[PDB]
Chains A and B, each alone.
Chain A
Amino acid sequence: MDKYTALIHDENFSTLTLNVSRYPKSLAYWEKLLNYIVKASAPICKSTEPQLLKLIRCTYSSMLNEFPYLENYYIDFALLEYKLGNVSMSHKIFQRGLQAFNQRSLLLWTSYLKFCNNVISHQKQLFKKYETAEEYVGLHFFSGEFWDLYLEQISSRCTSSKKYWNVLRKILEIPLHSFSKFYALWLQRIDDIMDLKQLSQLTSKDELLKKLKIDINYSGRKGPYLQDAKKKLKKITKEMYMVVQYQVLEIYSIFESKIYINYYTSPETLVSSDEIETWIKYLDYTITLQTDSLTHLNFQRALLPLAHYDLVWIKYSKWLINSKNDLLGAKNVLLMGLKFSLKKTEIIKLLYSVICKLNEYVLLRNLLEKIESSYSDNVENVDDFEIFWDYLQFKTFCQNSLYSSRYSDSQSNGLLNKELFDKVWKRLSCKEKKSGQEILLNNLVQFYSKDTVEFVEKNIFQKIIEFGWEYYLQNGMFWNCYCRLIYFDTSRSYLDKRQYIVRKIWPQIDKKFAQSVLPSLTEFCESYFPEEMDTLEEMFT
């Protein structure tokens, strides 16, 4: 047998593979399984077993579907595909990894350009990749290493040397962590100017004559005139340095000193509360500055330690809603936040409402169908009530709009529809195992019309009476909601409803339950029936 079959009949490959297959999201299992596979190929070469190489590519690519933000493994899968020889697949792995991060990542752009340098060999296109990298990641606080790459490529390839000045003048205004280095390059590269015509490298001719009073066409003794010119340009650089030093020292001292973790780890890692607080404040600072490249970069840069939380998926969505006025942008942010975050309830709530504002109701129907399908057409039985209740509100909006009303005065039947009322009754029938009983009753009360009040009274109030469910009968909120259903009927007159509540409803409750029911029922009575407050107190003592 070959090295592949010796690998596939190993005892360890069964357990490592099988632990990954049991626990897909835990990632120490994926890393042990992958390290073992790669190590059992003693030397990776162009002649190692093609079944074994196909097994390696399947392992890394499935891990990069499960955990799309691991930057270092996109780089490692690209370098492995380089060593095997085909630089085209390694191009596609770097571009796939850049795509996972919406183009906005410094490590992947830095490594993709250090790679690209060797293998492009077409100069206009190699430089167009640096001009693409610079618009997405160029304003990063740690982006000095990118600009070193761009400047060394310019200084080797270009013959003219105007492009170096034109790039370095832009770099002079970015508040980078290593901003001084490029000020020192500009100062040395000014200091080596050896005549007047070189000063047209720096800026334009007219700006020198008008703003700084330097004439390049000055014919005369040109020595001291040049020393005066260099003194003036060193002063204008001093003021620009002073601005950028204020920016950089402010950003470092408040915010960037405080963040310690800059990279995605695994869906099971926690972040300290300090870093959550300074990421929230640092995003607020960035949004104030109003540089949109830099706000998008800083949200993407902030999703790395805390992709799986959801406070920044919500926050980035809100910034797109109200500060940029963009709802399709915010839908795409929240929709992508479903993939990452573990909580998902606040995102689904806000995404339902973003879709409803975007007038795309069929997508809302599909998300409601996927949430009822995810619980096996049985959302009524979910332990966590917030899923069921948000589902049910937006499903009711779709349902009132979809089926015309059955009751008078165009009173849209919300929970009184045979599809929805069966879910509500099926959750009411579990009585203590489920969580959200009083909220569900308390929203069923709100109909206020004679036809609607009669249906709600007969189906949930009379029926839980006659079944004798002790949970609902001992509970004060049940009786309070029933009295409040009848009392706010616009149909019944005052004597009718007071007659009904005191004479029909209040005898029905048992006297053993008085110690449980009388706190709430008194609170109804004093609020609306001060006159009958003796009767109640007499009925239960």
Chain B
Amino acid sequence: MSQFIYPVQQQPSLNHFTDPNNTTVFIGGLSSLVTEDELRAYFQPFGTIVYVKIPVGKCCGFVQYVDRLSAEAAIAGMQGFPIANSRVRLSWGRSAKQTALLQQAMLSNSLQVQQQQPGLQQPNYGYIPSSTCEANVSSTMLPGCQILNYSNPQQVIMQGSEAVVNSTNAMLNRLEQGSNGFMFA
């Protein structure tokens, strides 16, 4: 036979660490004084967030981004940052239903098998990953512009030129209003 052959390798068995599609972030070490909106305000600018939830009393939370890129920017950006006087340990975690399935498999100790988080269905042309929109469009769809984006919660909206106004506009709102106390987050 020939001296050059293609390499072959074993699969690494699919937990939440070895899933390439996993976009949810386990934040651990939460301070129990921090709400879901206050944590959303921390993890918002890294991407668009499918959902943010905090288990009652369990001193940990989850943030589920839309992209893998956004989530890795989150884990690199906010690692050991003190959210309300307690340093925060970030890692990959699973969802809510997947966690319920792992706990019911942990009681019966039967299998503990995970399944893979869904992917977008490549190729997508409009989407530039890790890019956020806050709120009559005639788009020419030329490439530098961002034709498509995810609506904040959930829907698919086309970004425009006008949105760089709206974010700035909303920004001045939470500099003023949140200063007086009407949103702590």
A-side residues, CB < 8 A to B, are 180-181, 184, 249, 267-274, 276-277, 280-281, 308-311, 341-345, 383-386, 435-436, 438-439, 442, 523, 527
**Closest residue of chain B to A254, judged by CB?**
B20
Instruction: Indicate whether B87 reaches chain A with its CB closer than 8 angstroms.
Output: no
A-B contact count (CB 8 A): 81
Q: Give chain B nearest CB distance to A164 CB in angstroms.
A: 21
Instruction: Indicate whether B168 reaches chain A with its CB closer than 8 angstroms.
Output: yes
Contact with A along B1-17 (1 / 0, CB 8 A): 00110010000000000
Task: For the complex, give the distance between the alpha carbons of A190 and B180 in Å.
Answer: 78
Task: For the complex, give the distance between the alpha carbons of A249 and B169 in Å.
Answer: 48
Task: For the complex, give the distance between the alpha carbons of A523 and B120 in Å.
Answer: 42
B-side residues, CB < 8 A to A, are 3-4, 7, 67-69, 72, 120, 122-130, 141-145, 161-162, 164-165, 168-169, 172, 177, 180, 182
Contact A273 B127 (CB under 8 A): yes
Contact B165 A439 (CB under 8 A): yes
Residues of B within 8 A of A342 (CB): 142-145
Contact A436 B165 (CB under 8 A): yes
Q: Give chain A nearest CB distance to B66 CB in angstroms.
A: 11
* Secondary structure class of chain B's binding surface, majority of residues: loop
Sort A-B residue pairs by CB-CB distance and give the 10 closest, nearest first: A342-B144, A272-B123, A343-B144, A273-B127, A270-B125, A527-B180, A273-B124, A274-B122, A386-B164, A277-B129
Residues of B within 8 A of A341 (CB): 144
Contact B165 A274 (CB under 8 A): no
Known contacts being A267-B143, A383-B161, is A273 close to B123, with CB within 8 Å? yes
Contact B67 A277 (CB under 8 A): yes
Task: For the complex, give the distance between the alpha carbons of A342 and B172 in Å.
Answer: 29
Contact A273 B145 (CB under 8 A): no
Starting from the known contacts A268-B143, A311-B128, A439-B165, 10 additional A-B residue pairs (CB-CB under 8 Å) come to A273-B129, A277-B68, A277-B129, A280-B130, A308-B143, A308-B144, A309-B144, A342-B145, A344-B144, A438-B169
Residues of B within 8 A of A273 (CB): 120, 122-129
Residues of B within 8 A of A383 (CB): 161
Contact A385 B129 (CB under 8 A): no
**Closest residue of chain B to A281, judged by CB?**
B69
Contact A439 B168 (CB under 8 A): yes
Contact A439 B143 (CB under 8 A): no
Residues of B within 8 A of A267 (CB): 143
Task: For the complex, give the distance between the alpha carbons of A277 and B130 in Å.
Answer: 9
Task: For the complex, give the distance between the alpha carbons of A269 and B141 in Å.
Answer: 10
Contact A277 B123 (CB under 8 A): no
**Closest residue of chain A to B142, judged by CB?**
A342
- Cβ 8 A contact of B169, one of A271, A311, A439, A523: A439
